[PDB]
Design an enzyme around this catalytic site. Sequence first.
Site, PDB file in Angstrom:
ATOM      1  N   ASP A 186     -31.611 -19.982 -12.263  1.00  0.00           N
ATOM      2  CA  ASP A 186     -32.534 -18.725 -12.164  1.00  0.00           C
ATOM      3  C   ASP A 186     -32.365 -17.693 -13.113  1.00  0.00           C
ATOM      4  O   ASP A 186     -33.555 -17.136 -13.491  1.00  0.00           O
ATOM      5  CB  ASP A 186     -31.982 -18.046 -11.006  1.00  0.00           C
ATOM      6  CG  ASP A 186     -30.461 -17.627 -10.923  1.00  0.00           C
ATOM      7  OD1 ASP A 186     -29.814 -18.112 -11.802  1.00  0.00           O
ATOM      8  OD2 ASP A 186     -30.046 -16.695 -10.135  1.00  0.00           O
ATOM      9  N   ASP A 234     -26.433 -21.185 -10.361  1.00  0.00           N
ATOM     10  CA  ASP A 234     -26.822 -19.865 -10.814  1.00  0.00           C
ATOM     11  C   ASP A 234     -26.070 -19.470 -11.741  1.00  0.00           C
ATOM     12  O   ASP A 234     -24.951 -19.553 -12.179  1.00  0.00           O
ATOM     13  CB  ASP A 234     -26.521 -18.973  -9.341  1.00  0.00           C
ATOM     14  CG  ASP A 234     -27.155 -17.556  -9.470  1.00  0.00           C
ATOM     15  OD1 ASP A 234     -27.092 -17.059 -10.634  1.00  0.00           O
ATOM     16  OD2 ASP A 234     -27.301 -17.044  -8.223  1.00  0.00           O
ATOM     17  N   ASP A 245     -22.607 -18.591 -12.269  1.00  0.00           N
ATOM     18  CA  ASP A 245     -22.927 -16.910 -12.249  1.00  0.00           C
ATOM     19  C   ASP A 245     -21.747 -16.031 -11.717  1.00  0.00           C
ATOM     20  O   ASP A 245     -21.204 -15.015 -12.644  1.00  0.00           O
ATOM     21  CB  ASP A 245     -23.941 -16.668 -11.106  1.00  0.00           C
ATOM     22  CG  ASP A 245     -24.240 -15.189 -11.081  1.00  0.00           C
ATOM     23  OD1 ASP A 245     -23.685 -14.435 -10.136  1.00  0.00           O
ATOM     24  OD2 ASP A 245     -25.142 -14.560 -12.010  1.00  0.00           O
ATOM     25  N   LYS A 253     -33.144 -11.819 -12.224  1.00  0.00           N
ATOM     26  CA  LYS A 253     -32.342 -11.518 -11.071  1.00  0.00           C
ATOM     27  C   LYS A 253     -32.385 -12.963 -10.413  1.00  0.00           C
ATOM     28  O   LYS A 253     -33.311 -13.642 -10.325  1.00  0.00           O
ATOM     29  CB  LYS A 253     -32.718 -10.487 -10.296  1.00  0.00           C
ATOM     30  CG  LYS A 253     -32.721  -9.216 -11.195  1.00  0.00           C
ATOM     31  CD  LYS A 253     -31.147  -8.769 -11.463  1.00  0.00           C
ATOM     32  CE  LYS A 253     -31.118  -7.073 -11.631  1.00  0.00           C
ATOM     33  NZ  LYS A 253     -29.782  -6.538 -11.803  1.00  0.00           N
ATOM     34  N   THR A 254     -31.429 -12.972  -9.338  1.00  0.00           N
ATOM     35  CA  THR A 254     -31.120 -13.961  -8.451  1.00  0.00           C
ATOM     36  C   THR A 254     -32.511 -14.245  -7.420  1.00  0.00           C
ATOM     37  O   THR A 254     -33.006 -15.489  -7.457  1.00  0.00           O
ATOM     38  CB  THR A 254     -29.742 -14.317  -7.869  1.00  0.00           C
ATOM     39  OG1 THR A 254     -28.790 -14.019  -8.885  1.00  0.00           O
ATOM     40  CG2 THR A 254     -29.676 -15.409  -7.201  1.00  0.00           C
TER      41      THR A 254
HETATM   42 ZN    ZN Z   1     -28.392 -15.427 -10.008  1.00  0.00          ZN
HETATM   43 ZN    ZN Z   2     -25.159 -12.705 -11.185  1.00  0.00          ZN
END
Ligand code: ZN
Ligand code: ZN
EC number: 3.1.4.1
Length: 819
Positions: free
Chosen positions: A320, A115, A273, A152-153
């Site tokens: 992502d 992420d 992330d 966004k994730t």
């Molecule tokens: Zn993310």
């Molecule tokens: Zn984030």
Amino acid sequence: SCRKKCFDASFRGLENCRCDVACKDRGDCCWDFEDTCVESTRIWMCNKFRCGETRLEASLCSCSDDCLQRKDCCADYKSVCQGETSWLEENCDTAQQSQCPEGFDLPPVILFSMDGFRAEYLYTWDTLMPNINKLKTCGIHSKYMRAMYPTKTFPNHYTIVTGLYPESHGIIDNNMYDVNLNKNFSLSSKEQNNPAWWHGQPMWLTAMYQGLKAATYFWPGSEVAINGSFPSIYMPYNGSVPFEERISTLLKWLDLPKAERPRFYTMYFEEPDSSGHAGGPVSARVIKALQVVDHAFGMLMEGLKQRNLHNCVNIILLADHGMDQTYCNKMEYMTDYFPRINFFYMYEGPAPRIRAHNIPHDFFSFNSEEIVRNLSCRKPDQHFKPYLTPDLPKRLHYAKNVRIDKVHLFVDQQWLAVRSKSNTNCGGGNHGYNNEFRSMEAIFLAHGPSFKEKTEVEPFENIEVYNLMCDLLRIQPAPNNGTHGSLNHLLKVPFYEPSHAEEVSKFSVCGFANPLPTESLDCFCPHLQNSTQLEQVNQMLNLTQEEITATVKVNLPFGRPRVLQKNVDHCLLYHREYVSGFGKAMRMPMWSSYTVPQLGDTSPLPPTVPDCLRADVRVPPSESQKCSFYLADKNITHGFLYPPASNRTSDSQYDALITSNLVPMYEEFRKMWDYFHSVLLIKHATERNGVNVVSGPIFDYNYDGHFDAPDEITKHLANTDVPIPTHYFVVLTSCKNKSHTPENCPGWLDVLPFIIPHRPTNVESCPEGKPEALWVEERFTAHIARVRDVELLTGLDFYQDKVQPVSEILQLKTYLPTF
Ligand SMILES: [Zn+2]
Ligand SMILES: [Zn+2]
Ligand SMILES: *[C@@H]1O[C@H](CO[C@@H]2O[C@@H](C)[C@@H](O)[C@@H](O)[C@@H]2O)[C@@H](O[C@@H]2O[C@H](CO)[C@@H](O[C@@H]3O[C@H](CO)[C@@H](O)[C@H](O[C@H]4O[C@H](CO)[C@@H](O)[C@H](O)[C@@H]4O)[C@@H]3O)[C@H](O)[C@H]2NC(C)=O)[C@H](O)[C@H]1NC(C)=O
Ligand SMILES: *[C@@H]1O[C@H](CO)[C@@H](O[C@@H]2O[C@H](CO)[C@@H](O[C@@H]3O[C@H](CO[C@H]4O[C@H](CO)[C@@H](O)[C@H](O)[C@@H]4O)[C@@H](O)[C@H](O)[C@@H]3O)[C@H](O)[C@H]2NC(C)=O)[C@H](O)[C@H]1NC(C)=O
Ligand SMILES: *[C@@H]1O[C@H](CO)[C@@H](O[C@@H]2O[C@H](CO)[C@@H](O[C@@H]3O[C@H](CO)[C@@H](O)[C@H](O)[C@@H]3O)[C@H](O)[C@H]2NC(C)=O)[C@H](O)[C@H]1NC(C)=O
Ligand SMILES: *[C@@H]1O[C@H](CO)[C@@H](O[C@@H]2O[C@H](CO)[C@@H](O[C@@H]3O[C@H](CO)[C@@H](O)[C@H](O)[C@@H]3O)[C@H](O)[C@H]2NC(C)=O)[C@H](O)[C@H]1NC(C)=O
Ligand SMILES: *[C@@H]1O[C@H](CO[C@@H]2O[C@@H](C)[C@@H](O)[C@@H](O)[C@@H]2O)[C@@H](O[C@@H]2O[C@H](CO)[C@@H](O)[C@H](O)[C@H]2NC(C)=O)[C@H](O)[C@H]1NC(C)=O
Ligand SMILES: *[C@@H]1O[C@H](CO[C@@H]2O[C@@H](C)[C@@H](O)[C@@H](O)[C@@H]2O)[C@@H](O[C@@H]2O[C@H](CO)[C@@H](O)[C@H](O)[C@H]2NC(C)=O)[C@H](O)[C@H]1NC(C)=O
Ligand SMILES: *[C@@H]1O[C@H](CO[C@@H]2O[C@@H](C)[C@@H](O)[C@@H](O)[C@@H]2O)[C@@H](O[C@@H]2O[C@H](CO)[C@@H](O)[C@H](O)[C@H]2NC(C)=O)[C@H](O)[C@H]1NC(C)=O
Ligand SMILES: *[C@@H]1O[C@H](CO)[C@@H](O[C@@H]2O[C@H](CO)[C@@H](O)[C@H](O)[C@H]2NC(C)=O)[C@H](O)[C@H]1NC(C)=O
Ligand SMILES: *[C@@H]1O[C@H](CO)[C@@H](O)[C@H](O)[C@H]1NC(C)=O
Ligand SMILES: [Ca+2]
Ligand code: NA
């Protein structure tokens, strides 16, 4: 020493050194006790203290002489304890089916996401991540992978495994409200597990429905009963599970008996992330996390090599979205624009939306138009632009879902838009911005027997991965927004060979039968005084068969656009300088194609001659526009698709001053349209050694990204059935090798597609009395798109007569020019 004597209270070694729990208090433990007996149960690696050890109950993995038989060795056992070369130190060797052990006839797919792994990380910090860097060196990697907006994730993780734009798969943000369900979605509520939010078909189900088990480790959506079904194996999400344990579970799954062994796997890490948010993309914390995830990924590769699977697995490592830096002095506040903010709710941050506060009652009564109006062009340097979602650039595909509130703010790089100065979610890293910002680009690496080796590929969009994974598993994909075959250049032997989409509506003929019109169509060109003078001009529209061949060769160098709409009657209109495909029901062109040569003088085209329009003798009046339609309609006027002032002979501008080249244009839009064709187009031509243009109208009144059917168009000219376009497209096509012109281009093409919204004001550009030179180009640039986007919105298919493999043409059609 304590080797093979851990916790044995009976043992007395050198100088009676002890190897029992109570030894550490006495102070007579053997020198190697702590490393052989205590720490050996809390780590995932073998070392000189552990090799050949006696088994202990609480060890996370084993380095005992029987760990291979029991299938519980630490990943690095063979290299550390048996002296074999590690995966990391081995040279890049070809991955092929010969390197698959017995039973792995079909290679498994591992989809691995880290992420927030900004694409720029992979190149700046490459040598700090030896295992990922080796993957990048041996396997196939893209310059970057482009995410979907908002970056966004949950929206992007679900896009990856569905091939769907968020507006279609329903997860349009990590937080949202659905007025129909009257429910809230957030990552802290259990509503996230409600299958009502998740549309489409995720990859693990595509595989399971076709006989292939799937095991998921923490993918967004994997713990949801999407369509009433969980993955074959899945793990309830818990961010505290160490990355090493996750990799260990994955390796155990790969050890299962073939009858139970999954063939599709997903793995998910929260880093980099988490550290990106804490310290920002350029920070000590991010560096540390990049080293953590590289080590965990290395553990996976060593474990795969232990099993002789490192050249048998088709692995994909991606993210992502990227990560950027925010600043507390780079925040916009809604209090600066509204004296009262009580009445609306705002999803804050890099991709905000505004809706009514009292939901569901006021969700639809909410005046979204007023919000966007009152936020438009308020400060000359305001760092966001409000949009009604139908007005957002069409390449984002972010509007067709009731969960996407009508009010949107498009926020500038590194800025945040919040409700008031009480918000303090600033100073760290964040994401969600325009997917075209370089900071938002994600990584994509891949390696395995089905992928090409030591290859770098150009950037592509994450909506394409789904088709690729189905090709890797040799299964059929569910309907998605990828372009099946555009990633074939990543595969040694493509599983799916694309073909041209055959035309659905055949063209008819609009012949030149009478040089005088049967009807004037209420158009006037008094410059043409008597019929004789009119007859001469109209004869210029009557081209020999040799002249038709000549204008097609120059102005349709890649073939005419093919019509994939059904039951659409159309004919081609041939001119010396342009060729159009005329839609008879619309009474206007579906497309107009002309090649603009590079010219010595870059002079701006003077305006079209004003008072001269006439009927097109080749098109019957029932299928032609009347100039009186535009006088009757007060809110709109007429524009030209092909620019008449670009005539290259002394009288050929007559060829463009005909009803068949007219299209409905708001006065304000025509200013922008005319400036582009008078000034900017000529710069493009000289920069690219000539440029081919194909332009035409778009009708997308339901803003679903597809060409409208006639009965879906809700606005027409005067009281006629002539439709009003919601957009116009302009596709510039030239030769990638600038040494050739668009007509004489044997190699690759280069495209610059525009889908400009057809709006009655230019409020989007905040022109504030400035000249067009200061805002028109910026507005076109903001509305660049892929050719594929133009095709979807028009029902047309381009480039069918360009001799080149289909899969390469699909690469051209999914290409997005970036600035
Ligand atoms: Zn993310
Ligand atoms: Zn984030
Ligand atoms: C592309 O087409 C434009 C427009 O052509 C004009 O409109 C068409 C619809 C059609 O009617 C054409 O027949 C018509 O020319 C071309 O631009 C025009 O070019 C001509 C010269 O070729 C210009 O003529 C001059 O106009 C002046 C007005 O300001 C006038 O003062 C001039 O008069 C002097 O010259 C004439 C001889 O030319 C002489 O008889 C007079 O007594 C006087 O000395 C002259 O008439 C037009 O103004 C131009 N119009 C515009 C809008 O620019 C353009 O040349 C063409 N491009 C190419 C590459 O051929
Ligand atoms: C569009 O432009 C055309 C020029 O490219 C115009 O063509 C002219 O058409 C007229 C009427 O048909 C011809 O005059 C007739 O000719 C025939 C002889 O026909 C044979 O030869 C012609 C010319 O090659 C050809 O069209 C036929 O297929 C035959 O092979 C005579 O028998 C008649 O009595 C009459 O004189 C012209 O000869 C022809 N010119 C050229 C250069 O082709 C056409 O008229 C224009 N269309 C309109 C609607 O104005
Ligand atoms: C959600 O899950 C259901 C299953 O619970 C999926 O429905 C199944 O879809 C398949 C293919 O669409 C159906 O098989 C087909 O049946 C037709 C008619 O007999 C035949 O022509 C085909 O050759 C094929 O055998 C299957 O019957 C159907 N099952 C049920 C119970 O409806 C559905 O597709 C899933 N939806 C999504 C979006 O994943
Ligand atoms: C991206 O791909 C998805 C999936 O192919 C596209 O969504 C699909 O759009 C079609 C037509 O808009 C939907 O079919 C229609 O369904 C309605 C009611 O269900 C029916 O009345 C119509 O006659 C038609 O059959 C389809 O349901 C829908 N699928 C999903 C999963 O949403 C989407 O349009 C694509 N986006 C772009 C920009 O191309
Ligand atoms: C989330 O995970 C943490 C970390 O341990 C994981 O979960 C355990 C239940 C077990 O499966 C471990 O192998 C995993 O690595 C859990 O926190 C620990 O739980 C153990 C109980 O086994 C306990 O002894 C520790 O003290 C806990 N440590 C902390 C910091 O809480 C946690 O319980 C999991 N949360 C949920 C909701 O399941
Ligand atoms: C939305 O704006 C209108 C108009 O206000 C003007 O435009 C704004 C963008 C801003 O620049 C204001 O300073 C301008 O005056 C608002 O309507 C006005 O409201 C004020 C205060 O209630 C009133 O004194 C004016 O007479 C109104 N003018 C008109 C033409 O109606 C409207 O209230 C704003 N809506 C919201 C929700 O803030
Ligand atoms: C881009 O094309 C130019 C132009 O090549 C021309 O077209 C060829 C098909 C052939 O007709 C040549 O005679 C033309 O020159 C390329 O420039 C040429 O490159 C070749 C090397 O293969 C060289 O022998 C010529 O002298 C070059 N000519 C000129 C005018 O520079 C150019 O290499 C192409 N670009 C790429 C990246 O391949
Ligand atoms: C979804 O979350 C919002 C929070 O933004 C809730 O908003 C409340 O809505 C009610 C009306 O039903 C108002 O009376 C409250 O004042 C709102 N609270 C806030 C903080 O705005 C909404 O109720 C939630 N809906 C559901 C179904 O849970
Ligand atoms: C048409 O007008 C022009 C004027 O220059 C001239 O040829 C003549 O007056 C008319 N032609 C014919 C054939 O009547
Ligand atoms: Ca539509
Ligand atoms: Na008008």
